[PDB]
Amino acid sequence: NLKLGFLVKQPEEPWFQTEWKFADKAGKDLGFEVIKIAVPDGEKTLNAIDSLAASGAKGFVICTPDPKLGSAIVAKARGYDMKVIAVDDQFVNAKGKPMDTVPLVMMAATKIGERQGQELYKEMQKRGWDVKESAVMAITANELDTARRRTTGSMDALKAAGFPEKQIYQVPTKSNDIPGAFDAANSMLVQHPEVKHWLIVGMNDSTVLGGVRATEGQGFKAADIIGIGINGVDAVSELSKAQATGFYGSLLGSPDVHGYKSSEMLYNWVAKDVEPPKFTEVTDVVLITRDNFKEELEKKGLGGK
Ligand SMILES: O[C@@H]1[C@@H](O)[C@@H](O)CO[C@H]1O
């Protein structure tokens, strides 16, 4: 019957895999087929929409590889009589202002960022680190709003908790992955020999993991590193290791909700001109660590070690 697209920027992330999985579920529930496409860059994005059209899809959910493609995506879709819903990453105009008109479903970025900071500080306190010889490494992707609001949130929280502002070092990453974050963290590490203990701030699991990997390379032991990721699902391989690392835990969101709900809303729209709410913010979050990850996953229905 009805065909709907589910386009994601990073198909390799468990986050996005989970959104795909739950979109499938909505498909089975509501009676539509989900066409799952990877759109890692702008070219593939625009091409992919062309393909959808050839397939006779009525609309698509998208997590764009670039928010600035917003205009183009919308123009293309319009042309094809396709309805669009954005997941995770909000469309912006040329000027960098949000395209409010496109329905969006995303995490409560600021709130989750702030929770990251809170939990970083809590764990620091637990370990009894001397603030004097501690520092925050904030690996940023400021060109992406969602990423920005997380890392700002985190930094704000740390500062509010009384972590010295002067000891917070930001470094931009060129890619939102391990390799990117690794590179960034490495360059910051060598700049600060004075630091004995690091808090690692990053918008997601991969970013923080990259940070952790770099610290290990610069001869830091797990005890001296705290990195708390965001996503949860992305962190499972890390949390499953025999030995504890600098990667302490992750804030598990609801990619299940994002996948299912975005899909379901698109369907209602396409099938019944049921106009989605412009903004859907998902506030779920739980801290998963080495101790509780398996419970919490299975509790949330994302089972399997
Ligand atoms: O890239 C991130 C992804 O890892 C998840 O955190 C959702 O938001 C996207 O911007």
UniProtKB/Swiss-Prot annotation:
> Its induction, per UniProt?
Induced by arabinose. Transcription is dependent on the transcription factor AraC, the cAMP receptor protein (CRP) and cAMP.
- Keywords associated with the record: Periplasm, Signal, Sugar transport, Transport
Q: Name one GO biological process term.
A: L-arabinose transmembrane transport
Q: Where is this site: The binding site for the sugar molecule has not yet been established, but C-87 may be involved?
A: C63
The record's CDD domains line, in alphabetical order, gives:
PBP1_arabinose_binding
Q: Which GO terms describe its molecular function?
A: ABC-type monosaccharide transporter activity; carbohydrate binding; monosaccharide binding
Listed PANTHER family: D-XYLOSE-BINDING PERIPLASMIC PROTEIN (PTHR30036), L-ARABINOSE-BINDING PERIPLASMIC PROTEIN (PTHR30036:SF6)
Query: Record's family?
Result: Belongs to the bacterial solute-binding protein 2 family.
What's the protein called, per UniProt? L-arabinose-binding periplasmic protein
The scientific name of the source species is: Escherichia coli (strain K12)
